[PDB]
Structure formats: C-alpha cells, structure tokens
C-alpha cells in the first residue's frame, strides 16, 4: 500500500503537469479564435478591412 501511494502520487503529479499543459493552451486559443471569427464573419472580403 505504500507502493500504491507512491504510484498514485507519481501518476497525479505528472498528470497535474499535463493538466497545466493544456490549461495554458486553452486560454491561448480562447485568445486566438474569436478575433479571426469576428473579422471573418463580419462582411468578409467585401467588408473592406484591406
């Protein structure tokens, strides 16, 4: 059971590292998606953003 506690801690620490690894990138793509969404969906090429 001490081996099981060490196994669960070594699972959970690196799993929390992977949880941080996509929790950073989720907020990054939250910042990425919506600007290209709104100045793609507003008018388009005839919206003269050029």
């Amino acid at each position: 059971l001490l081996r099981d506690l060490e196994r669960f801690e070594l699972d959970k620490k690196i799993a929390a590292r992977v949880k941080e690894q996509m929790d950073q990138n989720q907020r990054e793509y939250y910042l990425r998606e919506q600007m290209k969404a709104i100045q793609k969906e507003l008018g388009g090429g005839e919206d003269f953003l050029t």
């Binding site: 992977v18 690894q21 996509m22 990138n25």
Partner: protein, 49 residues
C-alpha cells in the same frame, strides 16, 4: 474514444494513431504526427496541440 483508450488498446503506436486520426487537422501537422518514430515525442506533440 473509450474503445480507443488504454482499457482496450495497449500499444502506444496504435493508440497514438487512434487519438490522432479523430480530429480534422492541417496537412503538415498530420505529417508531423506521421514522421516521428519516438513514442514520447509524438505523444507530447499531440498533448501540446
């Protein structure tokens, strides 16, 4: 996705293919899945992106 998880697939190459096929990627990043012979490098690649 639970049939393509650890509970039914044990080989990380086959499980990496079954994770990486079930999205609609871009073509060059599908090639960076396909190019890598290392298990850990392509798994950290798909975990990153």
């Amino acid at each position: 996705y639970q049939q393509e998880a650890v509970k039914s697939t044990r080989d990380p190459a086959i499980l990496a293919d079954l994770v990486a096929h079930h999205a609609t990627w871009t073509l060059e990043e599908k090639q960076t899945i396909l190019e890598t012979p290392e298990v850990e490098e392509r798994l950290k690649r798909v975990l990153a992106l």
